[PDB]
Amino acid sequence: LIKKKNKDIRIIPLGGVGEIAKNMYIVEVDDEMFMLDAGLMFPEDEMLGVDIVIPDIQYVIENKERLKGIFLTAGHEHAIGAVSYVLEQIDAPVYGSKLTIALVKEAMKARNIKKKVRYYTVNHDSIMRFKNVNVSFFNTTHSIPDSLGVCIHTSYGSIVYTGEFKFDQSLHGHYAPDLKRMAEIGDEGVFALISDSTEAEKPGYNTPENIIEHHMYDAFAKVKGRLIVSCYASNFVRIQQVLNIASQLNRKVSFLGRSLESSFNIARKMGYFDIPKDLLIPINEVENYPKNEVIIIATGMQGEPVEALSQMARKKHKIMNIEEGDSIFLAIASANMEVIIADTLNELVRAGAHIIPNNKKIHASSHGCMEELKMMLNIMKPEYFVPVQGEFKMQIAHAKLAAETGVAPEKIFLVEKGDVISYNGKDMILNEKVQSGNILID
Predict the structure, then answer these.
(1) Strands, E, within 260-409: which ranges?
(2) What is the phi/psi pair of residue 224, to 5°?
(3) What is the sign of the dihedral through the CA atoms of 108, 436, 414 and 151?
(4) Burial of 213 by CB count in 10 Å (0-12 exposed, 13-18 middle, 19+ buried)?
(5) Strands 428-433 and 32-36: what pairing?
(6) 191, 196, 190: which is closest to 10 by C-alpha?
(7) Among residues 60, 174, 189, 299, which one has the fewest Cβ atoms lying within 10 Å of its Cβ?
(8) Residues that bind substrate, according to the entry?
(9) Is the separation of the CB atoms in 225 and 326 below 8 Å?
């Protein structure tokens, strides 16, 4: 006669607000706690002797008996970079797409962590049933395939976390978004939407990837010597574009960086790339070709591309350095990174390299611009809105979009790390803080 109902909700960012990476959002529904993403951030300019930055999870450790799962939206560093460190401290099942799980398993192997982990590979048809709530998933579009949003069903309506996403009609297959499923979620009733603010300041739409690839062909066709493309190892779309263009221009492709080899190998075995025969060469073989017959994709050792480019520009790289007359395509900017980018570009000009200019007509990111964020807000029609994944100015820009779409302004929460947004069935409040912070890994 009595149906179980939910009473108290908590939403707590431990990473990803006040900054551009390191997503980690804790959602509690009564006595069940869920961790949404567990990303890393690369060290800020002002940091020395540091490899990566991860969230402080002391609040989760203090309450770990209630942690029911870790839910990972995609296989990029902003979503999974901290997972291995989390798993060394707490035990919970790990839920993610086929690709995301394979990349997490590789990361655990790479750090030689042998604890038993309960992985669950989910897809957009999966419904994971807990005591208090059910969790479902929906395909999103990103630069890595097999990305998923997370939908926590409550008796107040859904709590939806988008992860990182954009909308681009030129991406299909494992990049295609679940627009019909998202409309169903919005119609059934969304209590709170937690959405990516990274490009909320940028009007219009991201430039479609087909048009980006056309522009890359035109730029690459003009390069007279070697080309170095600097991008994230998780930018599979960009890697695929380079492979296609290299084939068209009779250039070979070689990977520089442990991050790329690893992620590419896994993704290739699983079928995620279209790779012509004889296109890929070992980095050791690059110097055996004419300069105009090679493209080097340079990701970082830990996945940070700019650090590797800086090493190459100063001729400090262990494996391969920049030479006069090389050309650079920089396919990666946050407040955290603006200084190293400026210094690296100066270093490259000093070394006699040629930076391929950005096209004014082109805006390339993995994150929705204003119209894409408004599309998500209009589909989901949330009662409350929590903009995340951004510096505070980005969160504010995203809050402005939500107000434009009709979210009540007093139901928009602009949060800092460690803030607790809480609901008791009557009022949504911001009246508590938990421990949070940046953990430095060396």
Answers:
(1) 294-298, 327-331, 354-355, 384-388
(2) -95, -20
(3) positive
(4) middle
(5) unpaired
(6) 191
(7) 189
(8) 363-367
(9) yes
